RNA sequence: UAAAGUUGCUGCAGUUAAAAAGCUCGUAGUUGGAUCUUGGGAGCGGCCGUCCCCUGCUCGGCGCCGGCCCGAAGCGUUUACUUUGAAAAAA
């Protein structure tokens, strides 16, 4: 295909492409409102956490570090937040 | 590509276009700076401070919340260590390899990887001397490199 | 191709590919001037007037000749903008 | 009044009348404690395209962030006090010329032409933050900046787009269009 | 590493023209890249391009026509007096009828023909025909 | 000397014709990312093209009731670059 609209790519194409290689450089990570069932409050966890995220006074461990997107403990709900 | 490896990796972070603080984050610049001072005094590095912050305190960048970056915040109060933390970790790695070579004289690949870490230290050493954050009469001395943890 | 007086001096004005704007040599034997028939929009019949698109051999062996005619017909109101 | 010019010169009754209007919003309305400390430098009225007028109120830079917390609510009161006018807030940013061969300290990049022109553009739109700049260079050489604004606070700010073009056109001389990209965020 | 940014950009739009692409992305945006392109645009060789600001070095998308035969850089930026400019346009342009040699002068980045008018030599950036 | 693009700055070669160090580090050498003045005010010709402008602080002359308008010497980042000027024996 000769005539590609490089000005205006479809969102499907930029969601596919590497974060650095997009028309405008955009991260694939995000922050998320995470809450454990014991404690009241909601901690903001980073998707690719890479640390053992504890709640206040260690009510429980929330997020265990992995290769990429860090796994949340079984019983901990999350909502990804945007602006 | 990499400095002392044939690797040609494209693994860096990608900051978002918008430099604005988000809606959800209510933390004042002072509160973040007071938390940075609480983390730095606990025996932590600007690399580690930035991680511990952006994991469990929902802070994208310190430079976006505050006006300034983390080593500059430690420096302005007087908590930043004498020699930079990236040159610290290279010297620390070099000491650990040169400690490994005290028993394993046959390990020619460790000796080769030492000459690479040596070369990276001398290369930062000369950089930090041009930017005047190291004194010019400083030297990576393998005798007194073990003296510096 | 005027001289100083204004006389058109070269012996023929060569065609030029409608896709790439690259001139078509006297011996580019893979060229194609394709005539697309027009329509009386109420009836749907051949008028007698037709649109003429030229393509150089280079694009034809490149395999981009169909997508070029597709854009040229869409950019002529023949093919639907929707498509 | 709250009209505090840096020079030793008086305003017109226009700018003092705006400072009177913000003294009325201090003394009468609820937002009094968050307007005592807040002060205003200058203001202007410009003819924007069509049969509309655009009113622009300049602000000191260090108090601008305190004005950012009280922007849209205070715009509402000025939107119902001046009937058929769009009110917008720019920080009066001091600008230094390029140090030439002919012509003292280092010129800070905050006080430069581009940083101020981009900070003015950032502050024209408080409810919407800028999501992408696309500078078209047209066939005659003349530029056209295309600011892509957020889908959040679209309807709140979309009517002021026709104003914003004219307000930026006056201060910089840069013909700017504003769009709303749908597909990223 | 990347050293001449203008070089990368000109070769990139050259390789895009040769293939017959209608528009090309040139990844690092300089000031010198925009000036070169505006000079090519004013002589009709390219269409209306546009720069893409990420809060870094920007990108440019250029709308290519099929008019640009070649677009080249000269590295290093040799320093050209008015006397020498004829000997550069003799060995770097196809004809004396068309083709241009863009050079950064004190006046600004412009073609050899405007450099002759203004009576100002400067450093050669590249050429296009 | 040209021919010799068979010494290659212009301008050559190095998979197999002669040719890339066994490999890596490395000091001189060489080359080094983006980014810091722009929009205008004024006139002529038939929207466009050329022209005028975007630093201050001793003595004077278009003068005015110590100041302002104007000129002169001096102070005003460093080069490289380019343009002009001075100067440089003839043959």
Domain ranges in chain E are 1-68, 69-129
Distance separating alpha carbons of residues B95 and B93, to the nearest angstrom: 6
Contact E66 C62 (CB under 8 A): no
Contacts 24+ apart (CB under 8 A), B5-14: B10/A18, B10/A20, B12/A20, B13/A27, B14/A19, B14/A20, B14/A25, B14/A26, B14/A27
CA dihedral of B31, B33, B36, B38, whole degrees rounded to 10:
-60
Number of H helices, E strands in chain D: 6, 6
Q: What is the 3-state secondary structure (H, E, C) of B65-88?
A: HCCCCHHHHHHHHCCCCCCCHHHH
E78-103: burial string, b at 16+ Cβ within 10 Å, e else: eebeeeebeebbeebbeeeeebbbbb
Query: What is the H or E stretch that residue A15 is in?
Result: helix A11-16
Distance separating alpha carbons of residues E35 and E41, to the nearest angstrom: 10
- What resolution in angstroms, rounded to 1 decimal? 3.2
In a domain, B11, yes or no: no
> Residue E41 in contact with residue E49, Cβ under 8 Å?
yes
Query: Which residue is listed with tokens 């990420």?
Result: E54
Dihedral class, residue D115 (left if φ above 0, else alpha if ψ from -120 to 50, else beta): alpha
CA dihedral of B137, B138, B144, B147, whole degrees rounded to 10:
130
Contact E67 C21 (CB under 8 A): yes
Neighbours of E50 (CB within 10 A): 20
Q: At what angle do helices D13-27 and D71-79 cross, to 10 degrees?
A: 110
Chain D residue nearest residue E43, CA to CA: D139
Residue C36: strand pairing partners: C51
Q: What is the 3-state secondary structure (H, E, C) of chain B?
A: CCCCCCCCCCCCCCCCCCCCCCCCCCCCHHHHHHHHHHHHCCCCCHHHHHHHHHHHCCCCCHHHHCCCCHHHHHHHHCCCCCCCHHHHHHHHHHHHHHHHCCCCCCCHHHHHHHHHHHHHHHHHHHHHHHCCCCCCCCCCCCCCCCCCC
Residue E68, SS3 per DSSP: coil
Residue C24, SS3 per DSSP: coil
Chain E environment of D109 (Cβ under 8 Å): none
Distance separating alpha carbons of residues B1 and B62, to the nearest angstrom: 29
CATH classification of E1-68 is 3.30.1370.30, yes or no?
yes
Q: At what angle do helices B85-100 and B108-130 cross, to 10 degrees?
A: 160
Distance separating alpha carbons of residues B145 and B131, to the nearest angstrom: 22
> Residue E77 in contact with residue E100, Cβ under 8 Å?
no
Distance separating alpha carbons of residues D106 and D109, to the nearest angstrom: 9
- As a whole number of Å, the end-to-end CA separation of chain A is 36
Contact D183 A83 (CB under 8 A): no
Shortest CA to C1' contact from E79: nucleotide: F81
Total number of domains constituting chain C? 1
Chain E environment of C59 (Cβ under 8 Å): 20
Query: What is the H or E stretch that residue C31 is in?
Result: none
Chain E environment of A17 (Cβ under 8 Å): none
Contacts 24+ apart (CB under 8 A), D69-77: D69/D34, D70/D31, D70/D34, D70/D35, D70/D38, D71/D126, D71/D127, D72/D126, D72/D127, D72/D156, D73/D31, D74/D22, D74/D25, D74/D31, D74/D35, D77/D25, D77/D29
Distance separating alpha carbons of residues E40 and D137, to the nearest angstrom: 12
Secondary structure (DSSP) of D98-126: ---S-------GGGSHHHHHHHHHHHH-S
* Chains D and A touch each other (3 or more Cβ pairs < 8 A): yes
Distance separating alpha carbons of residues B15 and A25, to the nearest angstrom: 8
Chain A residue nearest residue C64, CA to CA: A1
CATH of the domain at C44: 3.30.1230.20
Instruction: Give the range of the structural domain holding residue C72, as residue numbers without chain letter.
Output: 1-83
Q: Which residue has the least CA–C1' distance to nucleotide F23?
A: B112
Instruction: Give the range of the structural domain holding residue B87, as residue numbers without chain letter.
Output: 81-149
For chain E, percent helix, then strand, then coil, each to nearest 5? 30, 25, 40
In a domain, B48, yes or no: yes
Residue A20 contacts E, CB cutoff 8 Å: no
Distance separating alpha carbons of residues E121 and C5, to the nearest angstrom: 33
- C 18-57 residues with CB < 8 A to A: 19-20
CA atoms within 13 A on the CB side of D143: 15
D53, with CB counted inside 10 A (0-12, 13-18, 19+), is: middle
Q: Give CA B146 to chain center in angstroms.
A: 19
> Residue E55 in contact with residue B19, Cβ under 8 Å?
yes
Q: φ and ψ at C47, to 5 degrees?
A: -75, -55
Distance separating alpha carbons of residues D64 and B111, to the nearest angstrom: 59
Distance separating alpha carbons of residues E9 and A81, to the nearest angstrom: 39
Give which of C5, C12, C6, C21 is closest to C56, Cα–Cα. Answer: C21
Pair type for strands E79-80 and E59-63: unpaired
Instruction: Give the range of the structural domain holding residue A29, as residue numbers without chain letter.
Output: 1-83
Using only the alpha carbons of chain E, give its radius of gyration: 14
In a domain, B139, yes or no: yes
CA atoms within 13 A on the CB side of B100: 15
Which of A2, A23, A24 shows the shortest C-beta gap to E22?
A2
Intrachain domains E1-68 and E69-129 with the same fold: no
Give the CA E120 to C1' F86 distance in Å: 21
Distance separating alpha carbons of residues D180 and D152, to the nearest angstrom: 10
Residue A76 assigned ligand-binding role: no
- Class in CATH terms, E69-129: alpha beta
Chain D environment of E37 (Cβ under 8 Å): 137
Pair type for strands C32-39 and A43-46: unpaired
Residue D152 contacts A, CB cutoff 8 Å: yes
Distance separating alpha carbons of residues C50 and C8, to the nearest angstrom: 29
**Residues 6+ away with beta carbon under 8 Å from D84:** D52, D53
* Chains B and C touch each other (3 or more Cβ pairs < 8 A): no
CATH of the domain at A24: 2.20.25.100
Chain D residue nearest residue A24, CA to CA: D132
Distance separating alpha carbons of residues B124 and C29, to the nearest angstrom: 63
Residue D85, SS3 per DSSP: strand
> Residue A83 in contact with residue B17, Cβ under 8 Å?
no
């Amino acid at each position: 295909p000769l005539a590609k609209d490089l000005l205006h790519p479809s969102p499907e194409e930029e969601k596919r492409k590497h974060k650095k290689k997009r028309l405008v450089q955009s991260p694939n990570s995000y922050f998320m409102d995470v809450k454990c069932p014991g404690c009241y409050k909601i901690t903001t966890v980073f998707s690719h956490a890479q640390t053992v995220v504890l709640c206040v006074g260690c009510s429980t461990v929330l997020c265990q570090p992995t290769g990429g997107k860090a796994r949340l403990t079984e019983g901990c709900s999350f909502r990804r937040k945007q602006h | 590509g990499r400095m002392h490896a044939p690797g040609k990796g494209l693994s860096q972070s990608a900051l978002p276009y918008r430099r604005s603080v988000p809606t959800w984050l209510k933390l004042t610049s002072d509160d973040v700076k007071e938390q940075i001072y609480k983390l730095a005094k606990k025996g932590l590095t600007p690399s580690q401070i930035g991680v511990i912050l952006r994991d469990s305190h929902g802070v994208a960048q310190v430079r976006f919340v505050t006006g300034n970056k983390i080593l500059r915040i430690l420096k302005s109060k007087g908590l930043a260590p004498d020699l930079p933390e990236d040159l610290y970790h290279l010297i620390k790695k070099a000491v650990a390899v040169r400690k490994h070579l005290e028993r394993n004289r046959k390990d020619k690949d460790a000796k080769f990887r030492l000459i690479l870490i040596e070369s990276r230290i001398h290369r930062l050493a000369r950089y930090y001397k041009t930017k005047r954050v190291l004194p010019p009469n400083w030297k990576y001395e393998s005798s007194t490199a073990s003296a510096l943890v | 191709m005027q001289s100083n007086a204004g006389e058109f001096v070269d012996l023929y004005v060569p065609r030029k590919c409608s896709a790439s704007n690259r001139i078509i040599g006297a011996k580019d034997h893979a060229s194609i001037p394709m005539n697309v028939a027009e329509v009386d929009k109420v009836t749907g019949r051949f008028n007698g007037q037709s649109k003429t698109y030229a393509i150089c051999g280079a694009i034809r062996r490149m395999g981009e000749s169909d997508d070029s005619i597709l854009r040229l017909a869409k950019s002529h109101g023949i093919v639907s903008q929707n498509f | 009044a709250k009209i505090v010019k840096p020079n030793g010169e008086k305003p017109d009754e226009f700018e003092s009348g705006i400072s009177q209007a913000l003294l009325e919003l201090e003394m009468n309305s609820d937002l009094k404690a968050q307007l005592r400390e807040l002060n205003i430098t200058a203001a202007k009225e410009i003819e924007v395209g069509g049969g509309r007028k655009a009113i622009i109120i300049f602000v000191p830079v260090p108090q601008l962030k305190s004005f950012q917390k009280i922007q849209v609510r205070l715009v509402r009161e000025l939107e119902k006090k001046f009937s058929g006018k769009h009110v917008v807030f720019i920080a009066q940013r001091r600008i230094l010329p390029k140090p030439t061969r002919k012509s003292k300290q280092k010129r800070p990049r905050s006080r430069t032409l581009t940083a101020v022109h981009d900070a003015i553009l950032e502050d024209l739109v408080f409810p919407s933050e800028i999501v992408g700049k696309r500078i078209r260079v047209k066939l005659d050489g003349s530029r056209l900046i295309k600011v892509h604004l957020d889908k959040a606070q679209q309807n709140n700010v979309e009517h002021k787009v026709e104003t914003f073009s004219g307000v930026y056109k006056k201060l910089t001389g840069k013909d700017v269009n504003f769009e709303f990209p749908e597909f990223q965020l | 590493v990347r050293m001449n940014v203008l070089a990368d950009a000109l070769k990139s739009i050259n390789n895009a023209e040769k293939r017959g692409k209608r528009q090309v992305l040139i990844r690092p945006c300089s000031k010198v890249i925009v000036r070169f392109l505006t000079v090519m645009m004013k002589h009709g060789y390219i269409g209306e391009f546009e720069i893409i600001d990420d809060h870094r070095a920007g990108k440019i998308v250029v709308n290519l026509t099929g008019r640009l035969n070649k677009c080249g850089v000269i590295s290093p930026r040799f320093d050209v007096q008015l006397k020498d400019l004829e000997k550069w346009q003799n060995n770097l342009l196809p004809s004396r009828q068309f083709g241009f040699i863009v050079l950064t002068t004190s006046a600004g980045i412009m073609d050899h023909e405007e450099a002759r008018r203004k009576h100002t030599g400067g450093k050669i950036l590249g050429f296009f025909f």
